[PDB]
């Protein structure tokens, strides 16, 4: 993960970072068991809560932190540590994490011309999820 790839990803992310709700929707849609961990969304129709204020609040926090991480590549260790601290005790599994990844990439493919940033994103996400999976 070098500056060339980092600059590519960050340019790519800048195009979509204003749509937190869209990104979280794509993740929840890829894996409903992620949605079922939120007391505020469990048992509801995803298509119906997508436009409500609670969804947006959550989406802004979650994609907000991801944004922090993308902004500081590649010095992400301390933030991954924080993520693991808050999420390890909620029982998040490797499956769910990989579905988060899949949902995000699906979002990125359906909203941008992704083919030009795909290898850089691959490097980034392999690095990030590589660190998470070593810790939880
Ligand atoms: C994919 C599996 C994941 C599951 C099952 C999960 C689950 C949750 C749950 C249950 C909450 C608490 C919401 C609330 O009580 O209001 C939450 C909050 C949060 N999540 Fe995750 N999350 C996942 C992935 C991620 C990822 C990849 C990030 C990185 C951006 C992230 C960042 C956050 C942040 C910043 C919060 C707010 C602070 C907190 O309460 O932890 N989550 N998530």
Curated annotation (Swiss-Prot):
Instruction: Kindly list the positions annotated as binding heme b.
Output: 58, 87
The Gene Ontology CC terms held by the record are: extracellular region; hemoglobin complex
> What domain of life is recorded for the organism?
Eukaryota
UniProt cross-references to SUPFAM superfamilies, sorted A to Z: Globin-like
Query: Which terms are listed as keywords in the entry?
Result: Heme, Iron, Metal-binding, Oxygen transport, Signal, Transport
User: Any S-S bridges, and between which cysteines?
Assistant: none
Task: Report a single Gene Ontology molecular function.
Answer: heme binding
Q: Where is the Globin domain?
A: 1-136
Extra notes?
There are at least 12 different components in Midge globin. The sequence of genes B and B' are shown.
Similarity comment text for this entry = Belongs to the globin family.
Entry protein name: Globin CTT-III
Q: What is the lineage of its organism?
A: Eukaryota, Metazoa, Ecdysozoa, Arthropoda, Hexapoda
């Amino acid at each position: 993960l070098s500056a060339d790839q980092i600059s590519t990803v960050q340019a790519s992310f800048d195009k979509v970072k204003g749509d937190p709700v869209g990104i979280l929707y794509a993740v929840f849609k890829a894996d409903p068991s992620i949605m079922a961990k939120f007391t505020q969304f469990a048992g509801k129709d995803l298509e119906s809560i997508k436009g409500t204020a609670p969804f947006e609040t959550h989406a802004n926090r979650i994609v907000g932190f991801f944004s922090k991480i993308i902004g500081e590549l590649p010095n992400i260790e301390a933030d991954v540590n924080t993520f693991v601290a808050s999420h390890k005790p909620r029982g998040v599994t490797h499956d769910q994490l990989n579905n988060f990844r899949a949902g995000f990439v699906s979002y990125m493919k359906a909203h941008t011309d992704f083919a030009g940033a795909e290898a850089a994103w691959g490097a980034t996400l392999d690095t990030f999820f590589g660190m998470i999976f070593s810790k939880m």
